[model samples]
Target: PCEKHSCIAVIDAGSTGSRLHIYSYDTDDTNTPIHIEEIWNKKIKPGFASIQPNSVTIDAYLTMLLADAPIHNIPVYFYATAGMRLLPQSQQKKYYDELDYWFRQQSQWQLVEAKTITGNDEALFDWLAVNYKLDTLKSVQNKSVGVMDMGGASVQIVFPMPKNAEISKHNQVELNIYGQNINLYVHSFLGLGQTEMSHQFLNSPSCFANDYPLPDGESGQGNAPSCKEEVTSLMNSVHKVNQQIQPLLALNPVNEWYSIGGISNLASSQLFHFENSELTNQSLLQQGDNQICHQQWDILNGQYPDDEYLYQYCLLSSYYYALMVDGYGINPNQTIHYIPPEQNLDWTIGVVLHRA
Candidate 1:
């Protein structure tokens, strides 16, 4: 598999997934824009909001090594996404101290700090893929191309169009990719991350019962109903995100775009109206005969005859959505900064818009 002298490896390692993006080059087909092959994701407990233990980071890297990346045995690169950046400085320092010291003892491993891509840079990736997909977009100089990137915690809107009096073209842009007179404009807001938002609601007093299961034979107002209602609110939030983002698509006619991150994968399920499956990691994990996400972890995990993961797992999961319902909660999956996803993580995620 080491057909070439070198391989450019991209690791989209974040709280939700530690994924590897490998691009293999072949001189035989010079026209190819790098073939995308193989994908591996190891779910982590902490989302963008918290710092995972150093061991978790090491284990994630190990999984990648064991599962894939041995073909060339060349060099492996790593990038930390929004999770690390948004982490409090004290916690960030804690991770660096532990990881740096431990890694020195481990191998020739280098866990360099990952760079955050700006909305402009994110736009370029979209534009880059679009160019590969079509020649017209690439050659048309100075013309604008609208870019929207949706991730776990945030949504980003990048308009590399003519100068706009309504919005400033500077601030939050990483770099200018062309001299084609692109007045690139970007706007982003935080607090829309999924896992972060969920944890916010999950920790509320209204969500949990003090007595939890209550007395078996006794009926109670404390637990079950609250759980169900919480989840329903979450699901409603996911749906409302659709209603909020309709304006972005209408702002400008999109030149063309392709997904480059996790939401891109999740968006497909929304498009197909995934009627069932999933309490957590909605794509692969599933709830049995329900839209509720993770209520039956005990049962689903086979320890169920004893404990309830959450009395109203369905409602809680739905409630998670209800909480971030406005922006579909995009997380900081990267290291230093965040490029929010413009496509709301709601019902409209992967649907192609068309004028009738």
Candidate 2:
């Protein structure tokens, strides 16, 4: 759909993987046209953490391409995420150095520094991309959708501010795009992500099953009830600290749900809430299920097996459920209608669209 003479590229070097995207857009002279087409895409194992800028160096394939100076000059924005975040400073710098040297030596692509992005920026860009695709960016109304993205390193919760919600300065941000100005409330829970938390509680008697795989190849006590209690308690503590700024569990009947009747409801008010939904009846609450996330976790572990990396599908499921229902005060019975971007839709599209 593009008659433009050139294209730009974006690289998302994530914790477990890296991806490249070459997008062709009509950059000659059009404002926000919906004509951007992906010309090429490739994903590879072991992200920037492996000291590889793109896993596939440009030199390896540069000679195979149809040459054009403008396309060569087109920018390639390499953004490293969680995997790099977990690296030691020295090791991180090493990767950055390698990338800089490679890019400079080639002098083909516009080499933007391969920067490591913060958890907050990760959340913000993702939020923007999700909403932009929903086609609400041009209306400029206070009404906006919310996004909750669970990654290997962090989980982000972002949404348009409800008129009655109280927000702290730290949690508030403003974005101007698509002929609109939008204010957003965003938060990223680090260390609380599945991988990070798995390491933190690996040896605890409360988490993982007796059969669960571990780095040391040993097993934990794996008490389900204890794990549930522990997860609930931990999430409660996090909620308390966060409450000083904004309520993580604010009950908005139109959008929130909590346990049927439990200790979690007493700790705070809101635990699990979603945008564009209602949950006021018992039957509505009864319709919710946890099997989806559970199965998805299983699928991932089977697809990507690493002993040094432990995958606790059941325990993470319990923790996620406990955190949402028990800690966040979400009704376990309520169905949360959340459909993530499929068909290769992810933060990359969001990143490119925003910078463009």
Candidate 3:
């Protein structure tokens, strides 16, 4: 039954954890993947970068992650994201060395490539994966679509654009898919993800819920506007997000916006109320302020016991607003559609579709 369709494994070694996805698909006349479906998936914590880079530990971790998969002998693409990018090359080499050795020892799992992908490449995959799920890749559309991925240690934004001599080559990707030619502008902010950015603002009172304890012995006052302003400094002053993205977006406007990653988790949480898996920047900030930021931290925490990320709601909200509205020049009222976090929509699917 399983042999009727082709199969591939893609491991997304993300900042917070590693996720394994096995997909089955049938190809169309153009050799483009169609009817793609996830057959199996497994996620493990403490991230690949956080683990000790040694033979014994690496072997144990790999066994625990892959031993239970229902199928084997398929090619696997092991792509690490922003977390591994944070490590020095020498350090990254150690992890890959052990991983390479481990794959060589086993015949069941064939390792194709295990390297940390650049944020720009990741952005391209983000756009592909979202558009694939939306069923828009089969034909060119009248409306322009943009995608944003809010990750743990990085954030990616990709939108339609024509190849320009003035733009940096690394920032744009051109590809032919399903007989349609597509050009996209891609950019990723390395240290602006939820976890990485939080380290710098852990002491900021405006970013946390009211009465939340800060690392510097102060209490959180929880002001969304103030927090947004504080985060904008990092986006504009340090990363120059506005300087790079605003002009391009103004010229090539996106009619619709789709987002993946942490924003989905935040939007779908019990803390915020949104409709149709969509939200606007203004509504997100206002909801964060009214429901979490300005509310009592203890009471909210006690109410939502299972929500581990509940504590970071205020900061995440403010950071997203700043990045989208203040930095990307997006209107606060513009609606952004988010794939439900439960679906686990991932870039690895893009790999599967594009590899064909």
Best by TM-score: 3
Model 3 over residues 40-102: C-alpha lDDT tens digits? 999988799999999999998888889999998899899999999999999999999999999
Ranking, TM-score, top scorer first: 3, 2, 1
In order, how many clashes per candidate? Answer: 43, 10, 0
lDDT of 1 by residue, 1-356 (tens): 44642334444445565544444433223222333223322333444335355767655644444354444333344445456656667876665565456545545444443344333343444444443333433244444444445446544445444454554444233332222223444543333444444455544433433323333332222333355355444444543543433344456434433233333334233321332221222321123114223223333334334333434343233333333222333221211111223422211111000000
Candidate 3 lDDT at 234 equals 93
Candidate 2 at 273: error in angstroms?
21
Q: Which residue segments of model 2 deviate by more than 4 Å?
A: 1-6, 26-33, 52-73, 162-170, 204-206, 209-225, 238-311, 326-330, 340-342
Global lDDT of model 1: 0.38
Question: Could you tell me which 10 consecutive residues in candidate 3 have the lowest summed lDDT?
Answer: 1-10
* lDDT string, candidate 2, 159-182, tens digits: 665434455566666766655566
Rank the candidate models, highest lDDT first. 3, 2, 1
- Per-model TM-score, in order, reads 0.48, 0.69, 0.97
lDDT of each: 0.38, 0.54, 0.91
- Model 1 ranges off by over 4 Å: 26-68, 72-77, 97-137, 141-144, 162-183, 197-356
